[PDB]
Design a protein around this ligand. Structure first.
Ligand SMILES: CC(=O)Nc1nc2cccc(-c3c(C(=O)O)[nH]c4c(C(C)C)cccc34)c2s1
Ligand SMILES: [Zn+2]
Ligand SMILES: [Zn+2]
Length: 232
């Protein structure tokens, strides 16, 4: 009923949308992994009379439900999608997207890691993102590679028209007391990567984590703190 939707409020297989700003929504879904249930976020950005999707809804059936929710709530076609790293909460569902006619994109690093992992593989490579601090435009957003953090390939997304920073899994929510799934993370580089984000997007008004509740710029420093404390 208007609050940001939480893990216990979303059955696995359902998807919710949350309006962030004019023309900007997050999508929220839940999935089971290794016997626990987690929420995860993605982004939707209006692109004229089309939509740009950032990240799948973590699985094929969730992603079909995402497309149905978008049609219900927004009614514009998703024409392109970007996955912000290689894990299943970002690329699981790419096959559903592709079969629905959505053009799917990721960095070459993400595509290689997804392939090697046995995850679904976005179709098109996003060049110009291989060095930390790189940025490229993609429709109504900027894609930024901050350096290794949650994963070596993680990208962040900025919506300049709305000052919305989507951190993906490189950014944690404020209630987080752990660094999440660190299997593929670089804990030593993560704080430096966050500092690059902070320097590059000082006017961000909303920061959206990969999992959990949006907030303001404090999520960035909070993430650096949680990661340093995990590493310690
Ligand atoms: C023992 C343990 O794993 N605890 C965890 N707590 C959290 C809290 C928030 C997020 C996560 C979390 C993240 C993330 O951090 O991006 N990715 C996850 C994936 C992908 C690899 C598909 C699977 C399962 C979960 C996550 C976790 S994992
Ligand atoms: Zn991940
Ligand atoms: Zn994640």
């Amino acid at each position: 009923s208007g609050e940001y939707p939480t893990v216990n409020e979303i059955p696995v297989g359902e998807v919710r949308l949350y309006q962030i700003a004019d023309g900007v929504w997050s999508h929220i879904a839940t999935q089971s992994f290794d016997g626990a249930v987690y929420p995860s976020n993605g982004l939707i950005v209006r692109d004229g009379d089309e939509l740009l999707l950032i990240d799948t809804a973590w699985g094929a059936k969730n992603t079909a439900a995402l497309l149905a929710e978008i049609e219900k709530q927004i009614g514009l076609p998703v024409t392109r999608a970007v996955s912000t790293h290689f894990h299943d909460d970002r690329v699981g569902g790419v096959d559903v997207l592709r079969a629905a006619g959505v053009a799917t994109y990721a960095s070459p690093s993400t595509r290689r890691l997804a392939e090697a992992e046995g995850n679904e593989i976005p179709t098109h490579s996003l060049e110009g993102l291989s060095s930390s601090g790189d940025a490229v435009r993609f429709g109504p957003v900027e894609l930024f590679y901050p350096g290794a953090a949650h994963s070596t390939d993680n990208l962040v997304v900025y919506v300049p028209s709305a000052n919305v920073l989507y951190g993906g899994c490189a950014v944690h929510e404020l209630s987080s007391t752990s660094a999440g799934n660190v299997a593929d993370a670089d804990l030593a580089e993560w704080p430096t990567s966050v500092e690059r984000i902070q320097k590059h997007y000082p006017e961000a008004e909303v920061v959206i984590p990969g999992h959990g509740l949006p907030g303001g710029l404090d999520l960035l420093q909070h993430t650096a703190n949680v990661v340093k404390a995990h590493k310690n």
